[PDB]
């Protein structure tokens, strides 16, 4: 019937520019995997979000800036 599923409204970013929605969901996922890891199901709501609404070259970028430690955002919560 209705098998499709995606991220909802996300009222903290309600404008047309959803770039910080793509950025912070990359942050809120990778801040979850290092701090307070007890399960993955409330931790993959930030994984399933940033796979949507993000280009593939940006995720290749954000996983390359993270690898040399040159990630401009705060990546290490611990």
């Amino acid at each position: 019937n209705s098998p499709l599923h995606t991220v909802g409204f996300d009222a903290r970013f309600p404008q047309q520019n959803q770039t910080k929605h793509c950025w912070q969901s990359y942050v809120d996922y990778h801040k979850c995997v290092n701090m307070k890891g007890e399960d993955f199901a409330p931790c993959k709501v930030f994984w399933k979000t940033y796979n949507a609404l993000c280009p593939l070259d940006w995720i290749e970028k954000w996983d390359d800036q993270r690898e040399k430690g040159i990630f401009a955002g705060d990546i290490n919560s611990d």
Partner: protein, 236 residues
């Protein structure tokens, strides 16, 4: 959809977001024909009937009882016409309950969609470019500079939500039959949410200039049904 030779109106409305524009382009031009109907009349009663008036009425300058009338007259139509113009702005950001997320990224000579929602069972995004077919590789019957090689499929009666950006020169994302137009800024990204309500192909164009190959970038998009779309998604 498809433009028509010697046409003068909008392309066919396939979106309620597009359908709102056609009832606002006609709500505006109904109040533009009274103003054009006045000026085209008030300039023919002067050039014809008053070019044969040798005695000039040179003692009517101020007119206080008509000075204040035509300064509330653009303040009485504009207060009326803005209320259908406010109801379209605040009801075209309806990204409350969406159903699908598709991408559209333009690398200065093509587009690059990816269907990164993982409803597809393979668990991988489906990325594919969109090159226009040249005149040498032109299959006989294809629309020139309006038909690409790798098109794009979207379901019908679904609350889709695009994400449009670029990694280079700014050039926008325009389908006139759906009323979607966002810039594709390089540093950031934009969204639109356009529910398509009829099966059929829509052709669009890229509007904002990119460089030498600005004419060689169409945006082909066809709407199929939701089981018929899923037979394409489980393949690629």
């Amino acid at each position: 959809d498809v433009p028509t030779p010697y046409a003068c109106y909008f392309q066919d409305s396939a979106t309620p977001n597009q359908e709102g524009i056609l009832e606002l382009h006609d709500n505006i031009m109904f109040y533009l024909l009274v103003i054009l109907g006045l000026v085209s009349w008030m300039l023919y009663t002067i050039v014809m009937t008053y070019s044969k008036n040798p005695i000039a009425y040179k003692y009517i300058k101020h007119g206080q009882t008509i000075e204040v009338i035509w300064t509330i007259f653009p303040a009485v139509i504009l207060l009326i016409i803005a209320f259908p113009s406010f109801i379209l702005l605040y009801l075209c950001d309806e990204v409350i309950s969406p159903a699908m997320t598709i991408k559209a990224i333009g690398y200065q000579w093509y587009w690059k969609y990816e269907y990164s929602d993982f409803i597809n069972d393979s668990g991988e995004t489906v990325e594919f470019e969109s090159y226009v077919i040249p005149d040498e590789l032109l299959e006989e019957g294809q629309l020139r500079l309006l038909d690409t090689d790798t098109s794009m499929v979207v379901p019908v009666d679904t609350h889709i939500r695009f994400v449009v950006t670029a990694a280079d020169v700014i050039h926008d994302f325009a389908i006139p039959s759906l009323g979607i137009k966002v810039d594709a800024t390089p540093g950031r990204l934009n969204q639109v949410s356009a529910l398509i309500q009829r099966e059929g192909v829509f052709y669009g164009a890229c509007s904002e200039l990119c460089g030498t190959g600005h004419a060689n970038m169409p945006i082909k998009i066809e709407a199929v049904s939701l089981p018929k779309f899923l037979e394409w998604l489980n393949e690629q």
